């Protein structure tokens, strides 16, 4: 080594990403007729939901005491 | 009295025939893929929202009729 800085560093990163997607679809027919009277119906429906979250945090302290390096790593 | 097929569970050829209680005024059939349902029902309950929610089925066809024991499998071509 032939240069120096003596000091302390603190670094903190937080990323959060979330997504939600939902969809619903329906198609239907209803019928009635009379000639005796008669009634019919027929159809389909589909539904979907998804949800995602990621939370990533990194905190690091390079410095001067185990106690307060830990404390600062916890609670800025 | 109303008279319908009213099988206790989906049955591909429902034979269980009953006089319906006063709760019912129509005979429903539904075909729901593998399943077939024949029930004492009501023409007001013969609505796709009801049939779909109450059967918990995604794709189906259903028919309702007034005559005695009239709700039978060949009534639906599906």
Swiss-Prot record, chain A:
Compartments, as annotated in UniProt: Secreted; Target cell membrane
Disulfide bonds: 34-37
Glycan attachment positions: 75
Disease linked to the protein: Complement component 8 deficiency, 1: A rare defect of the complement classical pathway associated with susceptibility to severe recurrent infections, predominantly by Neisseria gonorrhoeae or Neisseria meningitidis.
Functional description taken from the UniProt entry: Component of the membrane attack complex (MAC), a multiprotein complex activated by the complement cascade, which inserts into a target cell membrane and forms a pore, leading to target cell membrane rupture and cell lysis. The MAC is initiated by proteolytic cleavage of C5 into complement C5b in response to the classical, alternative, lectin and GZMK complement pathways. The complement pathways consist in a cascade of proteins that leads to phagocytosis and breakdown of pathogens and signaling that strengthens the adaptive immune system.
Family per similarity comment: Belongs to the complement C6/C7/C8/C9 family.
Subunit record text: Heterotrimer of 3 chains: alpha (C8A), beta (C8B) and gamma (C8G); the alpha and gamma chains are disulfide bonded. Component of the membrane attack complex (MAC), composed of complement C5b, C6, C7, C8A, C8B, C8G and multiple copies of the pore-forming subunit C9.
Protein name, UniProt field: Complement component C8 alpha chain
Gene behind the chain: C8A
Residues of the full protein shown: 342 to 438 of 584
From Swiss-Prot, chain B:
GO MF annotation, one: complement binding
Keyword annotations: Cell membrane, Disease variant, Disulfide bond, Glycation, Glycoprotein, GPI-anchor, Hereditary hemolytic anemia, Lipoprotein, Membrane, Secreted, Signal
Function, in words: Potent inhibitor of the complement membrane attack complex (MAC) action, which protects human cells from damage during complement activation. Acts by binding to the beta-haipins of C8 (C8A and C8B) components of the assembling MAC, forming an intermolecular beta-sheet that prevents incorporation of the multiple copies of C9 required for complete formation of the osmolytic pore.
Cellular compartments annotated: Cell membrane; Secreted
Disease: Hemolytic anemia, CD59-mediated, with or without polyneuropathy: An autosomal recessive disorder characterized by infantile onset of chronic hemolysis and a relapsing-remitting polyneuropathy, often exacerbated by infection, and manifested as hypotonia, limb muscle weakness, and hyporeflexia.
Cystine residue pairs: 4-27, 7-14, 20-40, 46-64, 65-70
Membrane topology listed for this record: Lipid-anchor; GPI-anchor
Effect of residue 24 to R: Some loss of function. Some lysis
Chief location category: membrane
Chain residues carrying a lipid of type GPI-anchor amidated asparagine: 78
Glycosylation sites: 19, 42, 52-53
Native species: Homo sapiens (Human)
Outcome of substituting residue 42 to D: No loss of function
Protein name: CD59 glycoprotein
Cellular component terms (Gene Ontology): cell surface; endoplasmic reticulum membrane; endoplasmic reticulum-Golgi intermediate compartment membrane; ER to Golgi transport vesicle membrane; external side of plasma membrane; extracellular exosome; extracellular space; focal adhesion
Record domain UPAR/Ly6: where: 2-78
Highest taxon above the source species: Eukaryota
Effect of residue 34 to E: No loss of function
Post-translational events: N- and O-glycosylated. The N-glycosylation mainly consists of a family of biantennary complex-type structures with and without lactosamine extensions and outer arm fucose residues. Also significant amounts of triantennary complexes (22%). Variable sialylation also present in the Asn-19 oligosaccharide. The predominant O-glycans are mono-sialylated forms of the disaccharide, Gal-beta-1,3GalNAc, and their sites of attachment are probably on Thr-52 and Thr-53.
GO BP field: blood coagulation; cell surface receptor signaling pathway; negative regulation of activation of membrane attack complex; regulation of complement activation; regulation of complement-dependent cytotoxicity
Whole-protein coverage range: 25 to 102 of 128
Self-association state and partner proteins as the record states: Interacts with T-cell surface antigen CD2.
């Amino acid at each position: 080594i032939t240069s120096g800085s003596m000091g302390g560093i603190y670094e903190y990163i937080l990323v959060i990403d979330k997504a939600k997607m939902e969809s619903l679809g329906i198609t239907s027919r209803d019928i009635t007729t009379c000639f005796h009277c008669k009634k019919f119906g027929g159809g389909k429906t589909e539904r979907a939901r998804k949800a995602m979250a990621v939370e990533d945090i990194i905190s690091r302290v390079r410095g001067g005491s185990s106690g307060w390096s830990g404390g600062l790593a916890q609670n800025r | 009295m109303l008279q319908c097929y009213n099988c206790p569970n989906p049955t591909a050829d429902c034979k269980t025939a009953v006089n319906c209680s006063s709760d019912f005024d129509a005979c429903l059939i539904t075909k729901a893929g593998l399943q077939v349902y024949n029930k004492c029902w009501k023409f007001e309950h013969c609505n796709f929202n009801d049939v779909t929610t109450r059967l918990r089925e995604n794709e189906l066809t259903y028919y309702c009729c007034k005559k005695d024991l009239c709700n039978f499998n060949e009534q639906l071509e599906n």
